[PDB]
């Protein structure tokens, strides 16, 4: 709702460098968007973003104030989903693909931008 | 080759001779052996950094060799993840006069199975008095958590199981752990906490029932209670060691977001234990 608009802005603000200089490192992650009643896939989706941007590795890559405001948006998002109460296997495998990409890239600055911009698409897709 | 039926906890395999270990993914051609699981004693093989992802749907082969002959035990192609059950969580306690604190993490910390799913655990437990055995069941807790309304010098026991609201998947229980709350706090805690705004600045007040106490007030981001590993309460400065039952500080002190609060009483010699906690939006109007 207000969380998506206010969440993407934070992702948007977090950018540390030119996207043009990172074009080389772009890669198709094949996000399974057909998955996007649906709540169980969403809670799965988010819990991964949270637990992903919470690594010691993520912390070195992004502004702490932005990261924080970010966790806060998702934190409230998870409670909302918690309350109401294979696809995930596919959504989980996707994050396996992402995790692997970063490793291989040794978490290069550009490799992090490739992923940030990709999560904005994944998230925005799942929200509309 | 008569097939075998195998269950999973965390990063382990459990059968239910000496043994060897293979798999071929659906889409199988080759057959590879997971290290350390060839010619082994036990019926559980651990594979952290042994198997790359547990998100595929595999097929297993088991070589069971009794004397001079080795039998063939296949395994119906499964997905590890779908079968995996959450291992017993790790439990850590800190005792008080009226209350207990819980710090919790997945057993098999850094589990390859869990990967990311870990920051997302919901925990649920059952606790009771040592002799009374009155069990108050408490589901849906967060990685670290505090329990109030208890009697001093009293031994409580408990076991914890993990759960993931995410996949229907739910976990095995920790061992039971017990502790005996300390003797009652001499200075009891400030008790009912409430916050309000006036003009732009901020103010909150509590009930300490004794005269001449100071109060060191602290805050925490609300979301950090779900993040068990590695966490610091920051103190609110205008309020540091105030002489009265309220203290104030302006709007700009908290950026918009969601926080946790707590309050402490001290006479300068024996301090008190902390008040109960509270949260707010940082949005009102």
């Amino acid at each position: 709702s207000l969380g998506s608009r206010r969440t993407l802005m934070l992702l948007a603000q977090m950018r540390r460098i030119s996207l043009f200089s990172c074009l080389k490192d772009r890669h198709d992650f094949g996000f399974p968007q057909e998955e996007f009643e649906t709540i169980p896939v969403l809670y799965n989706m988010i819990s991964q973003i949270f637990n992903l941007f919470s690594t010691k590795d993520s912390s070195a890559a992004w502004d702490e104030t932005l990261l924080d405001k970010f966790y806060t948006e998702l934190y409230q998002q998870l409670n909302d989903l918690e309350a109401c109460v294979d696809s995930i296997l596919a959504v989980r495998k996707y994050f396996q693909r992402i995790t692997l990409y970063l490793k291989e890239k040794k978490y290069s600055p550009c490799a992090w931008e490739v992923v940030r911009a990709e999560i904005m698409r994944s998230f925005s897709l799942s929200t509309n | 080759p008569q097939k075998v039926e195998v269950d999973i906890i965390d990063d382990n395999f459990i059968l239910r001779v000496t043994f060897s270990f293979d798999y071929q993914k659906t889409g199988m051609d080759n057959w590879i052996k997971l290290s350390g699981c060839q010619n082994i004693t036990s019926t559980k093989c651990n594979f952290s950094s042994l198997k790359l992802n547990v998100y595929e749907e595999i097929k297993l082969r088991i070589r069971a060799e009794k004397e001079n002959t080795s039998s063939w035990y296949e395994v119906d192609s499964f997905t590890p993840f779908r079968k995996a059950q959450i291992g017993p969580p790790e439990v850590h306690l800190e005792a008080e006069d009226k209350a207990i604190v819980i710090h919790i993490s997945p057993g098999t910390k850094d589990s390859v199975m869990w990967a990311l799913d870990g920051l997302s655990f919901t925990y649920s437990l059952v606790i009771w008095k040592n002799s009374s055995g009155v069990e108050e069941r408490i589901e849906n807790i967060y990685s670290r958590h505090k329990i109030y309304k208890l009697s001093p010098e009293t031994t409580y026991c408990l076991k914890v199981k993990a759960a993931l609201l995410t996949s229907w998947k739910i976990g095995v229980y920790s061992p039971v752990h017990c502790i005996k709350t300390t003797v009652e706090n001499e200075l009891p805690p400030p008790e009912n906490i409430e916050v309000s705004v006036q003009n732009q600045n901020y103010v909150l007040k509590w009930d300490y029932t004794y005269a001449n106490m100071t109060f060191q007030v602290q805050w925490l981001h609300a979301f950090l209670k779900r993040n068990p590993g590695n966490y610091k309460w920051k103190q609110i400065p205008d309020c540091e060691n105030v002489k009265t039952t309220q203290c104030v500080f302006p709007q700009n002190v908290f950026q918009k977001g969601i926080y946790l609060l707590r309050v402490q009483a001290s006479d300068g010699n024996n301090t008190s234990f902390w008040s109960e906690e509270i949260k707010f939006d940082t949005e009102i109007q």
Partner: protein
């Protein structure tokens, strides 16, 4: 370097740019783009290559609000290319929605509002009805679209504005007021 503004005007997305601190200024400009989600080659945008004018109509190029677009603008005067700026855009955040052309006609107890549309987003239409200091939102899209504000009264001046609303949080750009009394 250069500032990029992206607007949507009467159903078309216009990317425009301004230059900060340039002594030699370009004659012909060329704009390119790709997206981040796949490693695709920069496509030059057809209509915007070596144009004189600073603005490009990207409506047929940028369909989805779900991509991170990366653009490069190049400018030339000479046997010389002079420089090329890059920038990024997220349509759902960076866009700005310009208000439709509109007319009103006052009748006895009501007003005809004809919003001119020509013949891609989740946008909502709000026709504001304002009078005696009091504002009402009406939320009733191809070719000319008529909306009637009814239950109006004789001898009372009413003022009207229309605008497009993506999300409430993002700002809204309103048309000028047009006003009339009922006959």
């Amino acid at each position: 370097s250069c500032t990029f503004k992206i607007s949507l005007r009467n159903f078309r997305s216009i990317l425009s740019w301004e230059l900060k601190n340039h002594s030699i200024v370009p004659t012909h400009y060329t704009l390119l783009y790709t997206i981040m989600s796949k490693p695709e080659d920069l496509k030059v945008v057809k209509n915007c290559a070596n144009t004189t004018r600073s603005f490009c109509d990207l409506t047929d190029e940028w369909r989805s609000t779900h991509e991170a677009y990366v653009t490069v603008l190049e400018g030339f005067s000479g046997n010389t290319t002079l420089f090329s700026c890059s920038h990024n855009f997220w349509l759902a955040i960076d866009m700005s929605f310009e208000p439709p052309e509109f007319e009103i006609v006052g009748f006895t107890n009501h007003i005809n509002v004809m919003v001119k549309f020509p013949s891609q987003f989740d946008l909502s239409l709000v026709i504001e009805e304002q009078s005696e200091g009091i504002v009402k939102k009406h939320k009733p899209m191809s070719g000319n679209f008529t909306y009637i504000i009814d239950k109006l009264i004789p001898n009372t001046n009413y003022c009207v504005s229309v605008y497009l609303e993506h999300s409430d949080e993002q700002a809204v750009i309103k048309s000028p007021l047009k006003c009339t009394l009922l006959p």
